[PDB]
Design an enzyme around this catalytic site. Structure first.
Site, mmCIF file in Angstrom:
data_model
loop_
_atom_site.group_PDB
_atom_site.id
_atom_site.type_symbol
_atom_site.label_atom_id
_atom_site.label_comp_id
_atom_site.label_asym_id
_atom_site.label_seq_id
_atom_site.Cartn_x
_atom_site.Cartn_y
_atom_site.Cartn_z
ATOM 1 N N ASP A 202 0.680 -1.440 0.120
ATOM 2 C CA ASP A 202 -0.336 -0.390 -0.101
ATOM 3 C C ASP A 202 0.707 1.600 0.208
ATOM 4 O O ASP A 202 1.014 1.840 0.775
ATOM 5 C CB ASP A 202 -0.825 0.454 1.401
ATOM 6 C CG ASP A 202 -2.286 1.087 1.004
ATOM 7 O OD1 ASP A 202 -1.538 1.891 0.212
ATOM 8 O OD2 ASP A 202 -2.870 0.846 2.081
ATOM 9 N N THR A 203 1.373 2.080 -1.473
ATOM 10 C CA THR A 203 1.954 2.967 -1.712
ATOM 11 C C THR A 203 1.143 4.603 -0.556
ATOM 12 O O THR A 203 1.577 5.590 -0.656
ATOM 13 C CB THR A 203 2.248 3.287 -2.664
ATOM 14 O OG1 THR A 203 0.931 3.579 -3.739
ATOM 15 C CG2 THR A 203 2.839 2.043 -3.435
ATOM 16 N N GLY A 204 0.005 3.864 -0.681
ATOM 17 C CA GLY A 204 -0.639 4.804 -0.060
ATOM 18 C C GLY A 204 -0.898 5.232 1.558
ATOM 19 O O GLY A 204 -2.047 6.000 2.336
#
EC number: 3.4.23.16
Lengths: 4, 99, 99
Positions: free
Chosen positions: B25-27
């Protein structure tokens, strides 16, 4: 801390 | 590996000697896992997501193996809908976004 | 381009004749924008993440350019704290995760  | 995004980027991780599935999850600034026991001390913390804020347990310096790649860092535990690997550990395994 | 993950992967997008900053988010199924007054038909939806659910407006077939790469798809509008580019548009720009 932001977890989207 | 190269991971495309037509499906959720779910991978197997090892943590505290157990296998779990988690979403890359880059967020997420932080790694957050669903309720589980981890060894060592933890500190209460709060984090925010799209729906608001939750209380988590912060474990520091936790080893986590992600698709065979080693990381050692902060893992938050609490009422997340899905196990997420966030940027704190994504950076350690040399993960980038490319287009 | 290649985007490292030391910082939040924030990029410039163009939508509905506005340039905006948005987060490339592999952990998001959908694209969710901060409140904005887009023209067109929409329908209500609930989306969830850490903290619970929020109410959003679903708009279909909306052109969105992401760092010069054109996309067109569903955009959700609501009280998200940050503009979020989800997999629905990331796939259209050929975005991958690589490590």
């Amino acid at each position: 801390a932001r977890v989207l | 590996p190269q991971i495309t995004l037509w499906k959720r980027p779910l991978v197997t991780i090892r943590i505290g000697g157990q296998l779990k599935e988690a979403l890359l999850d880059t967020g997420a600034d932080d790694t957050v896992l669903e309720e589980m026991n981890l060894p060592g001390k933890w500190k209460p913390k709060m984090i925010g997501g799209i729906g608001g804020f939750i209380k988590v347990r912060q474990y520091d310096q936790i080893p986590v193996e992600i698709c065979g790649h080693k990381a050692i860092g902060t893992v938050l535990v609490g009422p997340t809908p899905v196990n997420i690997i966030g940027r704190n550990l994504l950076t350690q395994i040399g993960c980038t976004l490319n287009f």
